[PDB]
Design a binder for these strands. Structure first.
Ligand SMILES: Nc1ncnc2c1ncn2[C@@H]1O[C@H](COP(=O)(O)OP(=O)(O)O)[C@@H](O)[C@H]1O
Ligand SMILES: Nc1ncnc2c1ncn2[C@@H]1O[C@H](COP(=O)(O)OP(=O)(O)O)[C@@H](O)[C@H]1O
Ligand SMILES: Nc1ncnc2c1ncn2[C@@H]1O[C@H](COP(=O)(O)OP(=O)(O)O)[C@@H](O)[C@H]1O
Ligand code: BEF
Ligand code: BEF
Ligand code: BEF
Ligand SMILES: [Mg+2]
Ligand SMILES: [Mg+2]
Lengths: 411, 405
RNA sequence: AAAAAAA
């Protein structure tokens, strides 16, 4: 008997279930929960915590993008102090219907904090105190199944490897292939790294891409399409980044696929208080501090776990603002996979700008010979043009299934 | 006895009935005297809900703006049938107090009012990539059909498509859009066709009104930017409402670049101006307007094909174009150099294109276009068109052209 | 003022 489970079940099964026990769907669930409480049986609910300024908080739900919801569960301050709860903590426990003069479900006892024992949460090392590090463990994207879509993943490993705690960017003009390459990444993460906690944050992007993502990726998808205002974009992004930090505090390897980070940066610039100083492109002088901390949240932890963030960025949009945003995030991140519109217009995919792509400290994510082979490959591709580089590399890789066999051919 | 029907009938046909009983005043007198008899009087229009809670049924004669013949709608009626701005309402009215009032509604969006309450709101409809295609080729062998045939090869269009006709001035965008309307009415009469002309030429609406088989809402450049916005808002809301009734709506906008400028001049100064003179918050609403087009899984769809300006010498139009390109999923570019050589359509094949075009084409058609894509790419834009025009001119239809390959 | 524009 769980709240969110009743919200997920179809109306047909809810009406039937209600008739057996003896109005809008929310009323069906509410009436069914009340009747189940009268029997004396226990009721359960869950959601991600958001502590208000007064000291108390609520358990936002994913069906509301972790925003204010009618079925939010009240969490008393005493409960927060007992287990040292903070914004982002996923909470599950027994709940009760609202009494006379109340408007929300109350939390009786917390059973699980971040998919773990509540006693383990009180004693922990905060995310702000975790010792950062460069990416150590390699997150190889290559399927190896010889798939035609795997070509993108294979070229990515050779151009810009990705590790746990990476802080990368898929930079390219509109219609270059950022989203689908991000989707290709999501597929390889679910297959090669089912141990990682996968999250897909969609900010100010196409609505049909939201449903396309949630029915394609094997993970959680939090979205806020361009039908939504900038105020919603920020708040939604804040909840997702904090939930990730909480899981990292439990030594979890979280991966956030953001699209787009340029849109998110514009949103912050829309809600930022005017400072009387504007940068080139119409960017507020204090607007990029928040997005820089959001992107900079991604990091590798020595104590355990990591936070990875692969976000897409826009360039050559005709607006100098997007040039400033991209360059500011490049001085913040440590990995960039560029995609060329010139290559994409020739229908050559993946339209990857090999020379401009790359990853920082890639020697910590590759073997000694793997790095030496990648080093030689770049020296050969560099003199080539953007289009010729991809047509050359794709034709060579298509001959073999894996990059390891491709390397064996080079000798 | 209908209100907007009396407004359509000539004054001569009006005076005939007016004298037997005993232009705006004589209509108001006929409706009033008819009400004295106890007989039913009728009226209609598109609803616009104000801030207080009540609304008015705007007339298509005033471009859905405020009108003396607008019908009053009480808040109880809006709540009764869960009406929202954009709903087409018809029913009995009453003589006024300086405004007619709706007695009871007979049809809500051309359907029983009770059925319009159990519907899902447009914001809750599940979006999707276009799966049903709107083949533009007529295959009649006409010279105008060439335009639609090249379009089917360069950038396919489907239900819920969100595309643009990008080109410099005098490249052939409007005449392209007119060719669109002709194919929409001839190939897909089932679709609700609308043509929204914003800040454009006055002779192009009169030419459109007679050319296209549908509705034409206009707002020439003789009108302020504030009017352009309000007119567009009304049209896009009416489209959303029809999509809520599972209708395949198609809006041919011209121009959306003019619409984006209108918003840019209306939006309050934010203290931040993007490159080209575009306010930092000026393009939000235009994005939601153009981004209204989408394919619905529950049924119906909204397709928007708008023209866009480039190479205007103004960086502003370059920012708007790139912004809409990152919002839509289809573009059909037109070259000024091809148009100056009298080569029509002046389509820039390599620049044009449609996203997820595999969901709109058969596997054979996709491969044919893929090969033809690689062959045309090395050619110059002028040499590309003159090459494709000749090959397509040899045949009446694209299917037989695919057979030559 | 900055942004924009200009360069
Ligand atoms: N002397 C060097 N030898 C090898 N690689 C270097 C050297 N200097 C910089 N790099 C490369 O540059 C990356 C880091 O650049 P960084 O010093 O952060 O530049 P910046 O400080 O200008 O951002 C590393 O991943 C490294 O591979
Ligand atoms: N398919 C066509 N066939 C012949 N002439 C055309 C065609 N398309 C455009 N034109 C020429 O272009 C002129 C109008 O261009 P227009 O459609 O207004 O371009 P834009 O809308 O980009 O300003 C007409 O005078 C016409 O001669
Ligand atoms: N790996 C790929 N294989 C084939 N087509 C691709 C690939 N990546 C992108 N595309 C093409 O790009 C279009 C979508 O581009 P998108 O990913 O939205 O770029 P962006 O996100 O930069 O706007 C699709 O229609 C698709 O045909
Ligand atoms: F149009 Be892409 F999503 F930048
Ligand atoms: F990214 Be570098 F540190 F400027
Ligand atoms: F002059 Be065109 F209508 F852009
Ligand atoms: Mg994208
Ligand atoms: Mg025109």
């Amino acid at each position: 008997m769980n709240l969110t489970e009743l919200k997920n079940t179809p109306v047909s099964e809810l009406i039937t279930l209600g008739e057996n026990m003896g109005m809008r769907k929310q009323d069906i669930i509410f009436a069914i929960l009340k009747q189940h409480a009268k029997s004396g049986e226990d009721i359960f609910g869950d959601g991600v915590l958001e502590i208000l300024q007064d000291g108390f908080g609520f358990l936002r739900s994913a069906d509301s993008s972790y925003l204010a919801g009618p079925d939010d569960i009240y969490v008393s301050p005493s409960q927060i102090r007992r287990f040292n709860l903070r914004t982002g903590d996923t909470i599950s426990g027994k709940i009760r219907p609202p009494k006379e003069g109340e408007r929300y479900f109350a939390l009786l006892k917390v059973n699980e904090v971040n998919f773990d024992k509540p006693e383990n949460a009180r004693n922990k090392i905060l995310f702000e105190n975790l010792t950062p590090l460069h990416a150590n463990s390699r997150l190889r994207m290559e399927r190896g199944n010889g798939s035609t879509e795997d070509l993108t993943a294979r070229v990515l490993d050779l151009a810009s490897p990705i590790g746990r705690g990476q802080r990368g960017l898929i930079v390219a003009p509109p219609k270059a292939g950022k989203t689908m390459l991000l989707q290709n990444i999501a597929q390889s993460i679910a297959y090669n790294h089912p141990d990682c906690v996968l999250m897909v944050l969609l900010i100010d992007e196409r609505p049909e891409e939201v449903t396309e993502m949630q029915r394609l990726v094997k993970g959680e998808v939090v979205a806020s399409t361009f039908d939504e205002p900038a105020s919603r974009h920020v708040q939604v992004a804040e909840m997702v980044i904090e939930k990730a930090k909480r899981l990292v505090e439990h030594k979890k390897d979280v991966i956030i696929l953001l699209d787009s980070i340029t849109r998110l940066a514009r949103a912050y610039n829309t809600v930022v208080p005017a400072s009387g100083k504007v940068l080139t492109g119409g960017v507020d002088a204090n607007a990029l501090h928040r997005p820089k901390r959001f992107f900079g949240a991604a990091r590798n932890v020595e104590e355990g776990g990591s936070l990875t963030i692969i976000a897409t960025a826009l360039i050559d949009t005709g607006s100098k603002m997007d040039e400033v945003i991209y360059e500011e995030f490049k001085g913040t991140g440590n990995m960039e996979l560029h995609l060329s519109r010139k290559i994409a217009e020739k229908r050559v995919f993946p339209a990857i700008d090999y020379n401009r792509s790359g990853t920082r400290k890639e020697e910590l994510l590759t073997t000694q010979e793997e790095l030496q082979k990648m080093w030689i490959l770049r020296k050969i591709i560099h003199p080539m043009g953007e289009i010729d580089a991809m047509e050359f590399l794709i034709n060579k890789l298509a001959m073999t299934k894996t990059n390891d066999d491709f390397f064996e051919m080079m000798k």
